[PDB]
Structure 1
Amino acid sequence: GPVIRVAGDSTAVGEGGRWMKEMVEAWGKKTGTRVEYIDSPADTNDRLALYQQYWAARSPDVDVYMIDVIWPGIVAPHALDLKPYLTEAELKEFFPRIVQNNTIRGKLTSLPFFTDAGILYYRKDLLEKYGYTSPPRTWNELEQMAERVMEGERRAGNRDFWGFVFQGKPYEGLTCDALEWIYSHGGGRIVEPDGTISVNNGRAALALNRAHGWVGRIAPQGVTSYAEEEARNVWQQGNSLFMRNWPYAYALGQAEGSPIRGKFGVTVLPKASADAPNAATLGGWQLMVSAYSRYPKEAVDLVKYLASYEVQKDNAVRLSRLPTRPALYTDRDVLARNPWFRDLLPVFQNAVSAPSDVAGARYNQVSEAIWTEVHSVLTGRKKGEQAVRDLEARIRRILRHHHH
């Protein structure tokens, strides 16, 4: 019979690729359908370029793609409209904000699978050791704590120890970290939902100068090459006081054999001042049926299974990844395993989106501009002032004649 072929999460990041293969295999066994899993590069922008080769070819070789929250506007022509396959009641079981994100000119491109938000991981053992009772609420506090703890851990012989790790590589992940920096300084959303390119302002410039100030000081020099996993690996070995990352890192750090099991918490990322907005960049992945799949019915069935209550539950319990169904946030087993889901749910609901809605099919060009200009600040090539001016000009060229 048919072989349903799935381009799912990458095996190069955490456990999500192995887990998703196992879920697809379980669906295949449950339904008596042959399945195959197609692996991906780690970084989301590299994954998009891979999937675009299949789509440009109208290839029937992949039936189901796991797609980023930032992609619906780009990928819509390559997606089977799911709307006729779901009742309204089924659709209302997902957060409406994500269903809306996934809907482009009325086409339901994809089902919400798991959401994501940037958060602050912190070593609570080390905060206590050094006389701190809460994680930092301001970036100034984060810097002061990092400097003091670093000075002590280094003095005590840990030459690998750093204050903060984050995603500073030139790729999409830096756009996510930089939106948090800019927004949490009162610098705006880089491109506002109404289309105003707002990034050339002194608050955004400051945010980027501050991040430069970390590099080689409280963060490693090499942070300018770090993606999710490079950051995670320094953190997880016990060598960083703080890390900015997504929720998936929590389960991994609690696993048996993790050096930091039981030694950390999570909270909202800090901000420049009490009246700035909390910043957590909205991430997450959706499930798309290819417009080129020869087997739409079977592929839709698989996508509904993967998005189902019990599979999202398993994702939350085993991999600490965030459901797209509100009902899971009141499930006793989900909350017993991840009590921090309760405390941070509002942070997750208030997550700030990158400008994918307003940039539409041009988002990947806009994001490339953002990460390259930001990266040039982190490397010390440019100051924040110049970078936000240059970024404004690049985004104006890219979005010229684009209306949302």
Structure 2
Amino acid sequence: AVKITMTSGGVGKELEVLKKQLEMFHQQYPDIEVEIIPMPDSSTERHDLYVTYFAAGETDPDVLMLDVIWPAEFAPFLEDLTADKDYFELGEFLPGTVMSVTVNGRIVAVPWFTDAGLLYYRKDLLEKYGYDHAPRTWDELVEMAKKISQAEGIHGFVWQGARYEGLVCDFLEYLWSFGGDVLDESGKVVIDSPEAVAALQFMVDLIYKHKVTPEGVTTYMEEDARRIFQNGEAVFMRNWPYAWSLVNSDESPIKGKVGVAPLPMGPGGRRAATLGGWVLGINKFSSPEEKEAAKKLIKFLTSYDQQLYKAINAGQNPTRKAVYKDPKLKEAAPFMVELLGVFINALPRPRVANYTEVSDVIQRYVHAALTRQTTSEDAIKNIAKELKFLLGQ
């Protein structure tokens, strides 16, 4: 009776699993038909597609698949879900993911699946040199990296330092773990702090002072760091969860020699991880019967059973805390079970409507500091100054 549309958003296995999920949904809700609107695989080619839907205020699509950095931009056009927070059981989701969908105190989407930065390390090299544990502080990681890389003739620590969005993600992990922040609760720019100068200066020192990170890191993206680490040429790597399937596969030279752990903490700081992933929103311009049908679909897809199903069959990490404790997940994918201790410290990038401009500014000055075109102090001061203009403060 009621027909709603949804955007995807998918690779071949991940979309075939979505089709099965929609089948199961239709069995439980026979009066609701769901139609998938095919969407560009590029994140950029698709961000402008949606703004067109809300430029012209279309009634379709009803259910939006949104990148975790888009809620603030789309919030004026998304159905307010704050009254439905218990209907969706948001208290049982990872705290970072609930933050990522709260825009100016309004629940504006529902977390679906998630990602976050973590630390990969050569487990064999750590025990060969007498290290019981993954580094718990950043200074501890420098000490391990320096000792082991010099004795083995490899690099210490590879990560993402090219001028792109990935650099922002790496930088926020240093900033947060050193005790700093971009915006506070009220949303005012607080990045101009000694913690932030310390965090950025630490990134520079990894290259030029301690020499545990190659100078080429200023050109590295995810796969550049991965290839070096996978070939045995780095003790440590910061990356996303996707790399585990690559570096622990059969044709991988380091298979069985890789451990994973949260990123380290800074002096007097936290452990931190930058949140990635996708969320589900409702077009506020759809008819009320399409919206009500859309809420039922989102409740179904983000339920415990469906997050378990998607995790086992498509490999996406759940957003509900409890799914990580399921015994079925522990035997089907024990690596995913280990990510719980990472995801409890994951935080979202700043929730601002003009995020892409905020990111451009951070990329510009952070990369300038990594290339020694400016000092950490000047980079942080300039970021704070520009962000205050961009945010009207």
Fold in common (TM above 0.5): yes
Matched, 1:243 2:232: no
Which residue does the alignment assign to 1:332? 327
Residue 222 (structure 1) shift: 3.6
- Pairing 1:4-403 to 2, within 5 Å after superposition: 4=5, 6-8=7-9, 17-30=11-24, 31=26, 35-41=36-42, 48-49=47-48, 51-58=50-57, 64-81=63-80, 88-92=86-90, 94-95=92-93, 97=95, 98-99=97-98, 101-104=100-103, 108-154=107-153, 161-186=154-179, 188-215=180-207, 217-273=211-267, 275-291=268-284, 302-317=297-312, 321-337=316-332, 339=334, 345-356=340-351, 360-401=352-393
Letter in 2 for 1:7: S
1:186-242 alpha-carbon deviations (Å, 9 max, x no partner):
3x1122223342222333223212212334843344432333344334334443321
Instruction: Give the match's secondary structure for 2:115.
Output: strand
Asked if the contact 1:65–1:287 (Cα under 8 Å) also holds between the matched residues in 2, the reply is: yes
Deviates more, 1:172-181 or 1:216-225: 216-225
Q: Distance in 2 between matches of 1:3 and 1:255?
A: 40
Q: Distance in 1 between matches of 2:128 and 2:200?
A: 31
Q: In 2 relative to 1, CA 33–76 (structure 1 residues): closer, same or farther, beyond 3 Å?
A: closer
Asked if the contact 2:116–2:343 (Cα under 8 Å) also holds between the matched residues in 1, the reply is: yes
Q: In 2 relative to 1, CA 317–33 (structure 1 residues): closer, same or farther, beyond 3 Å?
A: closer
Scaled by the length of structure 1, the TM-score of the pair is 0.79
Q: Distance in 1 between matches of 2:104 and 2:380?
A: 32
Q: In 2 relative to 1, CA 135–87 (structure 1 residues): closer, same or farther, beyond 3 Å?
A: closer
Gaps of 5+ in 1: 10-16, 155-160
Which residue does the alignment assign to 2:29? none
Asked if the contact 1:111–1:287 (Cα under 8 Å) also holds between the matched residues in 2, the reply is: yes
Which residue does the alignment assign to 1:13? none
1:136-191 alpha-carbon deviations (Å, 9 max, x no partner):
2222332232233333443xxxxxx53222222333332221121122223x1122
Q: Distance in 2 between matches of 1:353 and 1:336?
A: 30
Deviates more, 1:162-171 or 1:346-355: 346-355
1:253-278 alpha-carbon deviations (Å, 9 max, x no partner):
434444433221211212333x3222
1:2-49 alpha-carbon deviations (Å, 9 max, x no partner):
79452325xxxxxxx33431222224555475535423326xx67545
Residue 244 (structure 1) shift: 1.3
Q: Once superposed, what is the RMSD of the aligned Cα atoms? A: 3.4
Asked if the contact 2:8–2:36 (Cα under 8 Å) also holds between the matched residues in 1, the reply is: no
Q: Distance in 1 between matches of 2:283 and 2:35?
A: 17
Q: Distance in 2 between matches of 1:49 and 1:153?
A: 48
1:315-373 alpha-carbon deviations (Å, 9 max, x no partner):
434666432222212211223455566666455333344331xxx32333323222221
Q: Distance in 2 between matches of 1:182 and 1:28?
A: 41
Instruction: Give the match's secondary structure for 2:361.
Output: helix
Asked if the contact 1:82–1:107 (Cα under 8 Å) also holds between the matched residues in 2, the reply is: yes
Q: Distance in 2 between matches of 1:280 and 1:28?
A: 32
Q: In 2 relative to 1, CA 77–199 (structure 1 residues): closer, same or farther, beyond 3 Å?
A: closer
Deviates more, 1:136-145 or 1:228-237: 228-237
Instruction: Give the match's secondary structure for 1:70.
Output: coil
Instruction: Give the match's secondary structure for 1:176.
Output: helix
1:260-312 alpha-carbon deviations (Å, 9 max, x no partner):
33221211212333x32222233332122344668656655554443232332
Q: In 2 relative to 1, CA 34–202 (structure 1 residues): closer, same or farther, beyond 3 Å?
A: closer
Gaps of 5+ in 2: 27-32
Q: Distance in 1 between matches of 2:333 and 2:178?
A: 30
Letter in 1 for 2:186: D
Asked if the contact 2:6–2:65 (Cα under 8 Å) also holds between the matched residues in 1, the reply is: no
Asked if the contact 1:8–1:66 (Cα under 8 Å) also holds between the matched residues in 2, the reply is: yes
Asked if the contact 1:119–1:269 (Cα under 8 Å) also holds between the matched residues in 2, the reply is: yes
Identical-residue share of aligned pairs (%)? 38
In the alignment of these two chains, the number of paired residues is: 380
Q: In 2 relative to 1, CA 321–254 (structure 1 residues): closer, same or farther, beyond 3 Å?
A: farther
Which residue does the alignment assign to 1:158? none
Instruction: Give the match's secondary structure for 1:190.
Output: coil
Q: In 2 relative to 1, CA 338–395 (structure 1 residues): closer, same or farther, beyond 3 Å?
A: same
Instruction: Give the match's secondary structure for 1:281.
Output: strand
Q: In 2 relative to 1, CA 79–253 (structure 1 residues): closer, same or farther, beyond 3 Å?
A: farther
Q: Distance in 1 between matches of 2:207 and 2:240?
A: 21
1:40-66 alpha-carbon deviations (Å, 9 max, x no partner):
326xx6754554355434456755433
